């Protein structure tokens, strides 16, 4: 009955220092352990006894659940507990706790609380090393069905590296694996006269401005010194009543940026501001901002339903998303929430607050800048953070624009004390925090990369920090995908290195093997709507082209490829791609972490393919490596604003590249017609490059060569009066509005190869002809895009039409 | 040397009563007459000696011009003197004074002034009856070259009907033609104690609110009692601080609506309003509104460059047009000018002022209404007024919408006393102020219609009041065009009437004869860019179709046709049109004003044509009368927002209607391709009706009948994989985004007649197919236009594609 003395000792130390505690329970009676832990935690303190959070998948204790406020949440509903604070968190089903769930469920516990994780009944702790998960179902494919678990090995291996983690059994017995069995009791403090220096500084900052309003009443809301300084900077910018200011605030997750900006909004309202606009990537990012706006209003003695009213958008799915707040104390004032694409409504703005400015595409932010006062906040680390390259681009653009720019930072968290052990363990576990010709490609073994060896861990952090430097929002589920995928392989590009020194990864490539689908399943899928969706390239070309022979081949999909942000644009990605291609072409004739390519026999593959969001810079890189386009989605992505593009390369050695020419020619014929449906927005050059690349890739089939245009076929397209109209226009005797129904036919004649060899056009003429004929654009829209006067775009368009007319006349007369 | 006593008597009476005087000078030394008149006018009064305005075309007096402020203006620059006030106006060149110039140059003279008109040296006053004008050059054509002047006859005949008009010679001698030779001197008044009742009422209204602010200081700006009441209503609406009000103000031209609204804007600014928006058809309508806004600011003790700043749009042509005003007294306030199509920026508005609301198309006004406070002003009579039908529609819609609506009116002018004689004469001269089967068409003689006989004048006013009832802005130049055109004819539709009673005009038709152009001139024009532009239908079809045989025919153009607004939609316009057509088909086997059709032999004409702005209601009326479309402009009209459409009917009796089938078929082939260029905006039904009408009119040529589609031609359009994709979509195994490049081909196949007889489609299916295939519209845009859910529009579109697929399969297999 005597409880081990280390449990209350650790709980008391956490309560004294205001830091969390981690407990892992193994057995079939975890209810008693949780009850005992809660009793021990509650019997020591009274200021920290908040609600208890419980998270699960689908499914004394009886008295315990009937005495405390328990919020029950599903693993899929964890987005609803955002912004709360709990005194205890419980996770029940170990089988389905993805890293995304784990990051969210733990950050909502204040200092001094308990984090309890429940494990199913076991006899030995080694059965988790390969236990099946609820996510492995999506991993399995027809070709590959055996999946080896590696995340759960690292999860138990990392428990011994935490100094605040205790692992106990049903009978409350400490286990050797626990990394906090050496904790000694802390000396009892005396705070009767002793006070922390930070507390004294905070009290002094609050007191020196008590006699001033409204800042004196508002400053009583801050909890950290950095929060107080950020509020001081915001209020100093606001009260200056000059709209030539900009403040950018960057910090980790949980430092207090949203609350600070919310209180600054109330200060701005109290200072006489009328037009206030708030933008964010998602309306779920403003939940605490709009709470602290109302907290500031309450601290300013405003009354509800008499001084302000709240307008809430009930109709869409986000019912709780506030959209508008009206204030009628002295004169009418409003606070409006808009989308980042609605920059045309900011003509009369006075204050625009951009929450999560790093996760917004840069041109949208560039268009949201005006001649007024701007507040920006961004996340640089922690869960859902932004890659360093995007942040560097954002701050570089802001510095280029400058108007006064002031940058501030926050360090100390709010819910728990700085230097918390559980936060450090979580950041570690999820990784949340030479001449090119001389480089060499290597294969990284995944059995030892996830073995928690110090060298392997040091390399894994470097690779993950490499491949997430361009994400808009860091996601820790890709770590589990990389670890537990059955067919994924990792390749790293290193320079010349010596023995005993780990090479620094210049580039990293992740590849997946796809293909080899039985024709019975392809026929079943092509005759119905169901699709396993295990693969991406086999299952898309078959549906788009209604073909049954492509999905039976073998190929590789490049899931991810990323180089060092400091080493970009110097030739390493191309070298790594070429080396991988040569490896798969048979050009090279505790296991060690690094294996040379010459020591392993490659696979026999027919093609290699990639899927990415279309951009000119990325398309040029992929086209230089001999990739040809096959697909281009019509609906743009909401998170970025780009269309998915698929490219395939026929890398097979000594085989006929004819099955790909048909696909390329079909795509080329579809793109010309589809330029009017949702591809009207594309810049002319971007569509021109895709058309040129598809036409060049369609030449892999010699039967796809174009044929000339004869007089007999021409007479079936243009009547003699059409010829007369074209001739009159070419001589300058007609307006260009008259000969405008003939543009699609001439464009289709030129861009399909019939007229290509007869008349030659430059790049600018090709772009103008493509736009006018296939995208149906106006002359004034063309003038803006090309940065040329409108009266000059027509001058070069009359030269396209007086070269075609001569050929038509020679063909008809001859 | 002794001046006639009637001149100073009339001048003194005008000065006493505050009314203008009209003088006409004939001779070669009008300088001395003008000098004497100015001296006589100035020697009596001192409070009215303002600047002298001089208007001319191209080209003691020496001392006279060097002592007074004279503003010299050109006849083409009369738009620059808008809003001013002068004490004397002079018109020099009688040869080019169009009615539009005459209306503008006279309204800017305050009461008590002089209006002097100069006439060239003459021996008899009868030479003006047929004197050539500077406008007659545009009237002459190749076919008709003799023009008879009639406006100058009426101008001299109406001078004798004015009681304030004197006609004098070089030696200052009164002429019998003068209509004010019987004026007797007025008794000398005594205003030492006597005051006008209106002046007493105005003083009382000003005084009873002196102690209140800011209305007490602002009310000192009004000049009439009606202006004061309008300002009181505006300020009462503003100070209520409830945004559920609307005030509509209607009056003649010169009553004080713009100034009243300008002062109300200053009151709103002083009452704490932040967002204020001003819209108008043209930025030249706000010249006095923005002047009185600044006058109110000055009366409110605001200081320039310290309390407000003015932002002016220098870059466009309208440099003087103010676009934005910023106020920073207590908190930032602004006043913005927007275009009527910019209703999307009014999300945060508090006061929207719509000047000249009748001249704006009704849907724009309907979209400018919001949940805020609206001020409207409109012109109902006088120069540049709006027809009564448009105003009735506007007020009926406003009453339907209602929110509180309050309507006010102004009667008494500002610059001159009410009951002015010159204003009455100007309004008179320029006309600024049964079963259908039993009706009969008549021809109106223009030699007696403009002879100033009382009966002829009474009928002319009734006709002009008929044909201007739908104009957005009344223009008095059309009166001169109707009077002096060499080939124009007027027809009126009257019911059964008795002798001695003038019939009431139910409908009026104006026709012009066009055609008969020598082929030499047509060849010269078609081989260059120059065009006489005398005709409209011959000179447009020849250029659009590059044809040389149409312009040599003979035809009639219906310039105007309008019925009684109270008798609309009851069958009179159709009856008049049919009777005119039968008259021109040879179906009928001081001169009197009315001539029966049976008494005159018609002309031999091949076609009849009309040009109008496209609308569904007008297109249906014209199509019912067997008219076929030939042209449709691509650029919309700025004043209305509609595209010009041309329709022609082959009315010739017993001739081949084959020259028109070619034009109709060419237009039908151009419209299908041009639906993507600027006709994407058209509603589906409106384009469908035009396509159906053009296809039906193209059948006048039997060689234009369509042919069936054969398997050989089908195999040259769709590959077997395209057939497989279409079949898969028809069975519900594909997304509609996949088979979307095939839509233009199917639409062109169906709407050109190849597939029309094989597969039958209803009206809704035809509209959806036309939109999706030829206009490239989205599904969500289609759902809004058709007032149907988006998920139901697709359900009926999958029925179009499973009828075409079966025919294609039968054609291929068979
Ligand atoms: C290209 C690169 C790897 C090596 O390039 P290098 O450094 O090695 O440059 P190199 O010397 O070889 O040649 C010089 C030439 O490269 C060009 N170039 C030069 N600098 C840049 C630059 N900074 N950026 C771009 N191109 C550049 C060119 O400008 C220059 O032309 P030029 O000189 O010859 O003038 C390296 O740039 C890089 O990190 N690129 C970005 C990271 C990445 O992974 N790229 C490969 C992507 S595919 C797998 C993949 O992930 N697909 C996706 C993507 C999104 N999504 C969804 O979208 C959402 C998120 O978005 C959502 O989350 C979801 O994810 C998805 O589902 N699947
Ligand atoms: C149609 C009408 C005469 C006789 O029609 P009826 O009274 O007779 O009606 P009816 O019994 O015969 O048959 C019933 C059928 O008529 C229809 N219908 C019934 N009510 C209405 C209605 N209220 N309006 C419309 N259609 C209606 C239908 O709805 C119904 O179909 P439904 O039942 O069988 O259901 C008589 O409506 C009317 O005033 N329409 C307007 C005045 C006018 O002149 N119209 C002829 C125009 S061409 C010459 C001309 O001027 N061209 C231009 C025009 C503009 N511009 C430039 O644009 C600027 C200005 O905009 C710029 O200033 C410049 O001017 C230009 O340069 N040259
Ligand atoms: N001044 C404050 N007073 C009380 N609670 C606060 C204060 N500032 C932050 N918090 C709490 O701490 C959390 C901070 O999260 P937040 O600062 O919104 O994240 P981010 O760093 O992304 O802005 C909030 O959930 C809020 O409940
Ligand atoms: N209260 C006033 N004080 C002085 N002048 C005025 C006043 N109201 C109007 N006016 C003069 O009379 C003219 C009235 O024209 P306006 O009222 O703008 O025409 P509308 O009737 O179309 O609004 C203006 O040119 C202005 O100079
Ligand atoms: Mg935030
Ligand atoms: Mg006006």
UniProtKB/TrEMBL annotation, chains A, B:
Acetyl-CoA binds at residues 561-563, 568-574, 624. One of its GO terms (biological process) is rRNA acetylation involved in maturation of SSU-rRNA. Residues 249-433 form the TcmA/NAT10 helicase domain. Keywords: Acyltransferase, ATP-binding, Metal-binding, Nucleotide-binding, Nucleus, rRNA processing, Transferase, tRNA processing. ATP binds at residues 254-263, 415. Its main location: nucleus. It comes from the Eukaryota. Interacts with TAN1. This is RNA cytidine acetyltransferase. The gene is NAT10.
């Amino acid at each position: 009955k005597t409880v081990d003395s280390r449990i209350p000792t650790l709980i008391r130390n956490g309560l004294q220092t205001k830091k969390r505690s981690f407990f892992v329970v193994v057995g079939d009676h975890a209810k008693e352990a949780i009850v005992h832990l809660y009793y021990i935690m509650s019997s020591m303190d009274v200021r920290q006894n908040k609600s208890v959070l419980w998270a699960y998948k689908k499914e004394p204790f009886e008295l315990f659940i009937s005495l405390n406020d328990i919020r029950y949440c599903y693993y899929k509903e964890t987005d609803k507990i955002l912004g709360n604070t709990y005194g205890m968190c419980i996770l029940q089903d170990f089988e389905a706790i993805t890293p995304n769930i784990l990051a969210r469920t733990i950050e909502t516990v204040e200092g001094g609380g308990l984090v309890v994780l429940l494990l199913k009944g076991m006899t030995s702790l080694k059965q988790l090393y390969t236990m099946t998960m609820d996510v492995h179902a999506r991993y399995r494919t027809e070709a590959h069905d055996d999946v080896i678990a590696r995340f759960n090995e690292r999860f138990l291996l990392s428990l011994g590296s935490c100094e605040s983690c205790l692992v106990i059994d049903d009978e409350l017995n400490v286990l050797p694996i626990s990394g906090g069995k050496g904790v000694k009791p802390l000396p009892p403090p005396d705070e009767d006269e002793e006070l922390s220096p930070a507390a004294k500084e905070l009290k002094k900052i609050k007191d020196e401005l008590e006699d001033t309003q409204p800042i004196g009443s508002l400053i009583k809301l801050a909890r950290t010194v950095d929060q107080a300084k950020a509020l001081l900077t915001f209020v100093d910018a606001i009260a200056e009543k000059t709209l030539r200011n900009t403040v950018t605030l960057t910090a980790a997750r949980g430092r207090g940026k949203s609350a600070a900006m919310g209180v600054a909004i109330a200060a701005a309202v109290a200072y006489g501001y009328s037009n206030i606009f708030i933008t964010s990537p998602s309306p779920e990012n403003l939940k605490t901002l709009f709470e602290f706006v109302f907290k500031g209003f309450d601290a300013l003695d405003y009354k509800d339903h008499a001084d302000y009213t709240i307008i809430q958008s009930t109709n869409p799915e986000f019912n709780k998303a506030i959209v508008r707040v009206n204030i009628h104390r002295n004169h009418r004032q409003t606070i409006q929430y808009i989308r980042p694409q609605d920059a045309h409504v900011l003509g009369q703005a006075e204050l625009v607050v951009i929450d999560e400015a790093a996760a917004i595409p840069l041109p949208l932010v560039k268009k949201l800048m005006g001649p007024y006062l701007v507040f920006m906040a961004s996340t640089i680390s922690g869960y859902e953070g932004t890659g360093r390259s995007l942040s560097l681009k954002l701050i570089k653009q802001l510095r280029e624009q400058s108007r006064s720019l002031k940058e501030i930072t926050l360090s100390e968290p709010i819910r728990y004390a700085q230097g918390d052990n559980v936060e450090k363990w979580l950041n570690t576990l999820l990784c949340l925090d030479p001449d090119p010709s001389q480089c060499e490609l290597l294969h990284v073994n995944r059995d030892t990369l996830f073995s928690f060896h110090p060298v392997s861990e040091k390399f894994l952090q470097q690779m993950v920090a490499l491949y997430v430097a361009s994400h808009y929002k860091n996601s820790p589920n890709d770590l589990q995908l990389m670890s537990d995928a059955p067919a994924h392989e990792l390749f790293v590009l290193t320079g010349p290195i010596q023995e005993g020194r780990l090479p620094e990864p210049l580039c990293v490539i992740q590849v997946s093997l796809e293909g080899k689908i039985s024709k019975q399943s392809i026929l079943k899928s092509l005759s119905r709507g169901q699709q396993p969706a295990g693969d991406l390239i086999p299952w898309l070309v078959s549906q788009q082209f209604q073909d049954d022979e492509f999905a039976s081949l073998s190929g590789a999909r490049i899931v991810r490829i990323a180089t060092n942000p400091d080493y970009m644009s110097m030739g390493y990605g191309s070298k790594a791609l070429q080396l991988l291609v040569d490896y798969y072409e048979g050009k090279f004739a505790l296991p060690p972490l690094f294996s040379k390519l010459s020591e392993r026999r490659p696979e026999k593959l027919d093609y290699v393919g990639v899927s990415y969001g279309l951009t000119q810079q990325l398309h040029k890189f992929w086209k230089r490596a001999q990739f040809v386009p096959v697909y281009l989605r019509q609906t743009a992505n909401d998170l970025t604003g780009e269309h998915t593009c698929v490219m395939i390369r026929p890398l097979q050695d000594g085989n006929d590249p004819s099955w790909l020419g048909a696909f390329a020619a079909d795509f080329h014929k579809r793109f010309l017609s589809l330029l009017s449906y949702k591809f009207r927005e594309f810049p002319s050059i971007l569509a021109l490059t895709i058309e040129e690349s598809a036409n060049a890739g369609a030449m892999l089939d010699p039967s796809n060569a174009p044929t000339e245009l004869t007089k007999a076929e021409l007479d079936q397209l243009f009547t003699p009066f059409d010829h007369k109209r074209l001739e009159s226009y070419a001589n300058g005797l007609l307006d260009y509005h008259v000969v405008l129904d003939l543009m699609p036919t001439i464009a289709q004649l030129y861009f399909t190869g019939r007229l290509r060899e007869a008349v030659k056009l430059s790049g600018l003429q090709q772009a103008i002809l493509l736009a006018l004929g296939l995208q149906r654009k106006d002359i004034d829209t063309l003038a803006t895009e090309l940065n040329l006067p409108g009266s000059q775009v027509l001058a070069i368009f009359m030269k396209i039409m007086r070269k075609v007319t001569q050929h038509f006349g020679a063909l008809v007369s001859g």
